[PDB]
Design a protein around this ligand. Structure first.
Ligand code: R0O
Length: 269
């Protein structure tokens, strides 16, 4: 499912990150901008299998809300995975740098796109395992594209996946609930300064993240149901996409806001 790109058509420019056994670059493809993940010499057999395997599944995906593979360099060294370049970068940093700049409808549209990509991934029989705003890319139309840059994300991970390594679409739904909270808070840290062990204890004791400020009641209800302890009680991604699409198409439904519990009280006359 992957197109082979000749190395002379690819120019690496700046390093933008690191991979398992290589760097990640911004570059140009003959010139459309691209992101480039390389596998550097001395890579192991396992690393090659993982690297080309990643390319293989990526080339299979054709969806508006999944990062698009442009091609691969497998016949030459260094080997490369080349994707579209998303100019606004990762969602979490994007929202932290643009705090309060979007409408409720725009934010819920982001979540609908993320949910649509996850519905596709799950129905293609893939589990993400690390769904978080840091793994979602934003383009110049505000379209969110599910991605995976590699890593322990305790705060995003469902209880059963932490406790006995059961990673499924349903534990991805838990993570999606956390991503909903990330988006509606413009990138706040889930559970703030609580330690990983304190987060697990609070969840086991039934506590859950409070409502964001200015959050539609419907949206908080949906993220709450993503965090049900009983995995079978969580919505499927099809349910999430359906609800988000109904709220967006009847946008007055988003004007009713969940109560925000103040953490500070200002007494003035
Ligand atoms: C080049 C490149 C290669 C690979 C990927 C990628 O998304 N891989 C991928 C692997 C697997 C899956 C599904 N599997 C998940 C795990 N499950 C167990 C099984 C299913 C998916 C899926 F489906 F979720 F989308 C995606 C992304 C890019 N491109 C970017 N990456 C970075 C970047 C920055 C810093 C550090 N690293 C990267 N910045 C970029 C771009 C583009 N623009 N910018 C600014």
């Amino acid at each position: 499912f992957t197109t082979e790109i000749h190395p002379s058509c690819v120019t690496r420019q700046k390093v933008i990150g690191a991979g398992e056994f290589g760097e990640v670059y911004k570059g140009m493809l003959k010139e459309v901008p691209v992101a480039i993940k390389t596998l550097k010499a001395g890579y192991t057999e396992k690393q090659r299998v993982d690297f080309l395997g990643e390319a293989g599944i990526m080339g299979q995906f054709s969806h508006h809300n999944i990062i698009r593979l442009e091609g691969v360099i497998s016949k030459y060294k260094p080997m490369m995975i080349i994707t579209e370049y998303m100019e606004n970068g990762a969602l979490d940093k994007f929202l932290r740098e643009k705090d309060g700049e979007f409408s409720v409808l725009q934010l819920v549209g982001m979540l609908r796109g993320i949910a649509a990509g996850m519905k596709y991934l799950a129905n293609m029989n893939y589990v993400h395992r690390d769904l978080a705003a840091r793994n979602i890319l934003v383009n110049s139309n505000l379209v969110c594209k599910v991605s995976d840059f590699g890593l322990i994300p305790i705060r995003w991970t469902a209880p059963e996946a932490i406790s006995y390594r059961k990673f499924t679409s349903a534990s991805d739904v838990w993570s999606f609930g956390i991503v909903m909270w990330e988006v509606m808070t413009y990138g706040e840290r889930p559970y703030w300064e609580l330690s990983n062990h304190e987060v697990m204890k609070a969840i086991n004791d039934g506590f859950r993240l409070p409502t964001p400020m200015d959050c539609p009641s419907a949206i908080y209800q949906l993220m709450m149901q993503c965090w049900q302890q009983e995995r079978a009680r969580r919505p499927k991604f099809a349910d999430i996409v359906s609800i988000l699409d109904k709220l967006i198409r009847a946008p007055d439904s988003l004007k009713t806001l969940a109560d925000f519990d103040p953490r500070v009280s200002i007494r003035l006359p």
